Amino acid sequence: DIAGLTPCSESKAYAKLEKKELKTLEKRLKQYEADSAPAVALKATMERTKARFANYAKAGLLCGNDGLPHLIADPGLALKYGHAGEVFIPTFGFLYVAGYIGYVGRQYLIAVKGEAKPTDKEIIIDVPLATKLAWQGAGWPLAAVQELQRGTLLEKEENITVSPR
């Protein structure tokens, strides 16, 4: 398909790698009993390996000449060939959680900056205020867009210190 790759469900190297992993696990299992802890652990690892290979092939991932899955980062190719779950959806997921953390921290700093000793609140975290801001940070994109549109997101150039050039 994309970049001359082949789907993992049809790649021979993919199935060969799965057989190799199951073969080394079975070889290690051949030295133990049939109802012992190492045997059960090795069988669980084998089942996990089989489930992982079947799930990766079911997801529609593309495998190269090495039999390993390859990710598609281009939004056009990912949305046109059903690869948005690799790099697109996790991108927006990270953006949401990262902006969540940044917005909560910024709100906490702005909240404690108007007190008597903000540094004291910076070393000794005010748990009730932090918990309230952490719960209220779910609407961080809407609140951030509103702050940017009102002009309260940035600080004026005259209020920021600079070097003597």
Partner: protein, 217 residues
């Protein structure tokens, strides 16, 4: 003062006289998204549009679906009506969507300009004389003229009640459509089918037994 949580502290931005004039004010804003008055006004417009659109869609899904259960109609499921309608149609879905986007963009742009400047659509000599009727009322999101032909908004005594019946119903519709999606991804049948299946045996046919809503059980 009706509240969404008896005993909870109502936010200060939802207790102002301007915010209290909005329909369905129950002091529900835990995230504090309506702290800014401009943002609150914009979200009020968004909620009104969502309420009306959800009411129209849920009605178009429920009424034909309920009539299909009986012998009145034969309308297919909402998740399959698009394919059935586009099969014996005169245009593909792309061309239809393009025409729809143009027609919807025109009226949405006019509504957007009215939101930015109330009554600005009444500019003389700009809409072939129909601009006089394009000026909304004193409340944003509630225009008159061509809209509201029966003139039920002229009576103020019921006005405050009418708005309360529009937002609340709309909110319910907004949840209904959401359920329509979740049920589609949990049972594989239509809403009327799910209602009948639950009415046949509610103690065993619910979201606690679908195997999706409770993966830990």
């Amino acid at each position: 003062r009706q509240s969404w949580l008896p005993g909870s502290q109502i936010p200060a931005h939802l207790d102002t006289p301007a915010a209290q004039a909005l329909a369905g004010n129950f002091g529900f804003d835990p995230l504090g998204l309506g702290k800014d008055p401009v943002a609150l006004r914009w979200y009020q417009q968004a909620e009104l549009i969502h309420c009306r659109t959800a009411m129209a869609g849920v009605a178009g899904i429920l009424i034909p679906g309920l009539l299909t259960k009986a012998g009145a109609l034969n309308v297919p499921e909402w998740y399959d009506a698009g394919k059935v309608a586009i099969e014996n149609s005169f245009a593909p879905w792309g061309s239809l969507l393009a025409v729809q986007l143009f027609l919807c963009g025109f009226v949405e742009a006019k509504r957007w300009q009215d939101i930015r400047k109330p009554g600005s659509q009444g500019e003389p000599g700009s809409f072939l004389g129909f601009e006089a009727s394009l000026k909304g009322t004193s409340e944003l999101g509630y225009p008159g003229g061509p809209f509201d032909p029966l003139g039920l908004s002229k009576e103020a005594d019921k006005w405050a009640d009418w708005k309360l019946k529009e937002v609340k119903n709309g909110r319910l519709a907004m949840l209904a459509f959401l359920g329509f999606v979740a049920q589609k991804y949990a049972t594989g049948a239509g809403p009327v089918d799910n209602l009948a299946a639950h009415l046949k045996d509610p103690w065993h046919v619910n979201y606690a037994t679908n195997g999706v809503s409770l993966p830990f059980l």
